[PDB]
Ligand binder design. Structure first.
Ligand code: LBV
Ligand code: LBV
Lengths: 313, 315
């Protein structure tokens, strides 16, 4: 099963009980964005991140009464149609708001049962993706495909280190390709225990295909209330990219000297084949539109891995 | 019966009939569609060899001036990028794309690929979260039918085409329309089946390597290359990989007779085989700009993946 989260007086996590930390329900988010939850029917704002006032420019109480209808007039009917009752928690809808306080915000919404989860992040506003797609497809074998993928991602993102991280049948991990800035340790060829990515993290990575820690030293921002009014239970945040990262994993990243981390799942035959894994030495908020490019690349790599593995077997 | 290609018309080959379809050399027509321009150049020196006859009007230069310069001089910023992206021996399927600001012609999209020692350069005029939203909707579709319907509707919304269908090949190469989105008033092709010879065996082979083809105007005359043969080889210039390549006059007659002014289809490739087509129709001529066509190319790949996934959920 899972332990209760901390804020419901559950045990603190150790290397004895890695597998039991309820990473989906931390009750908090990373501070480079803001999150609101809301009722599926009424559009009634039920929870907000204590930092919402910053991003939205709204007097705190104003929000926690109001309706999405009021708050987002153009958007609220689109949401209603895009995310019908009963849809999967994996389905997401995005829009760009030109919002008074903040030039442009990206809005990302998904639905978990009766709750809409809304994420707001700063945003903005060429051929590198098309060029990359053809490059991946003409790679002659899996090894070269891995090399092209890591190089392409590094060029698109500027990340200090990009890895392709392949799982063995026992969930042992192996770095099979790597693109990195001069003057970093090489992780190429190295293998790591299964517990470095626990079973509960791997399952959630099979369904929700991108996550990040924008700053490995930033404090999480609580949800208020912490419990969903609807259920008097924790809000599931696994489908939210703003979700606070596990402190265990933040400790792991800090001990390696990483300041910003991001990975993308490569899913083949319904299973987690590996990850595009990115390190930066310093804090780094990759903007939403560039993340989208990596999300596309994730799908394309999933296709090409199967194609390429089929021409060996 | 499968038989080798006839020589093209310009090398004294025969004219093509319903009898000998499968032998038309549709990859070497010696000509392009008039809404863009094409140059060929030597892959090592960058000497310009062939150009479409309309090139002066896209590029704003006399032929003899174009042909008298190397790509190093014509494309000083792109020439080194081309050479890195398209190394000798690379496959003909690999494409490099850039946007140019050309004085006379505005923003041009440049698409380049390499066939042996030849570079092929295509120039076309070029111009929010719809793709991301579509990607997730496709993935959440519960079964093959719902996927097919979401895919057709999405493509129609992105493009404005009068008719978007999902054409699926059977094992005998007969095809069947299994989903479609269509303009009000058009009659339905859903569930109709069409014989294998409608897309003969050599088109289907080409459609497995080069994943998008089109006919922007089913009545437009083709524009010859000049000279027609590659001076490197005194042989035909391979245009299989060029979206500007002229459509078979057989297929254009088949389209005009249906009332179709514009045609475009994307290959859906599963396990190395052509599974089906995103086929689109417009009643009037219609040019879809290169950046919009890129969205369809990306959806072609997504759909190939999702078709595998939906079919595996099915035994
Ligand atoms: C008690 C268990 C511990 C534990 C937990 C844990 N680990 C993650 C997530 C990740 N761990 C990763 C491991 C590596 N990253 C690398 O770069 C290398 C090699 C150089 C390794 C071995 C990765 C890639 C992830 C994914 C997240 C990311 O991209 O940064 C989690 C889940 C984090 C979250 O989503 O909140 C957890 C709970 N880690 C340990 O080391 C043990 C002691
Ligand atoms: C003598 C041979 C004939 C022939 C040849 C032919 N057909 C193509 C390409 C296509 N044919 C297609 C057929 C259909 N389009 C539809 O809308 C329907 C049904 C409602 C069918 C059956 C399609 C989709 C294509 C693909 C190209 C496109 O999307 O427009 C070629 C190759 C053309 C080229 O690439 O230059 C050839 C040679 N068709 C016949 O009917 C016989 C007489």
């Amino acid at each position: 099963p899972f332990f209760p989260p901390l804020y419901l007086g559950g045990p603190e996590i150790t290397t004895e009980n890695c597998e039991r930390e309820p990473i989906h329900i931390p009750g908090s988010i990373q501070p480079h964005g803001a999150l609101l939850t809301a009722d599926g029917h009424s559009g009634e704002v039920l929870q907000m991140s204590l930092n919402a006032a910053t991003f939205l420019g709204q007097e705190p109480t104003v929000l926690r009464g109001q309706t999405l209808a009021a708050l987002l007039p153009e958007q609220w009917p689109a949401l209603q149609a895009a995310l019908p009752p009963g849809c999967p928690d994996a389905l997401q809808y995005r829009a760009t708001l030109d919002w008074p306080a903040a030039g442009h915000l990206s809005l990302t919404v998904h639905r978990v049962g009766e709750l809409l989860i809304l994420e707001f992040e700063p945003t903005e506003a060429p051929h590198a993706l098309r060029n990359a797609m053809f490059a991946l497809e003409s790679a002659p074998n899996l090894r070269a495909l891995a090399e092209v993928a890591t190089q392409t991602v590094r060029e698109l993102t500027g990340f200090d280190r990009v890895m392709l991280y392949k799982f063995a049948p026992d969930a042992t991990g192996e770095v099979i390709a790597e693109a990195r800035r001069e003057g970093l340790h090489a992780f190429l060829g190295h293998r790591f225990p299964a517990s470095d990515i626990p079973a509960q993290a791997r399952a959630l990575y099979t369904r929700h295909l991108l996550r990040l820690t924008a700053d490995t030293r930033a404090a999480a921002v609580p949800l208020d209330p912490v419990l969903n009014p609807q259920t008097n239970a924790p809000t599931p945040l696994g489908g939210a990219v703003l979700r606070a990262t596990s402190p265990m994993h933040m400790q792991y990243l800090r001990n390696m000297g990483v300041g910003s981390s991001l990975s993308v799942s490569v899913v083949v035959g319904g299973q987690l084949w590996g990850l595009i894994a990115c390190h930066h030495q310093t804090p780094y908020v990759l903007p939403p539109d560039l993340r989208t490019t990596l999300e596309y690349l994730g799908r394309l790599l999933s296709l090409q891995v199967q194609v390429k593995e089929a021409l060996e077997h």
